[PDB]
């Protein structure tokens, strides 16, 4: 997933 470090959205699957 886009578990980045300024992860926003609701994609928030790390």
């Known amino acids: 997933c ?3 470090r ?3 959205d609701h994609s ?3």
Request: aromatic content about 12%; some cysteine; glycine content about 0%.
């Open 2 to 4: 886009n578990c980045s």
């Open 6 to 8: 300024w992860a926003r």
């Open 12 to 14: 928030r699957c790390c």
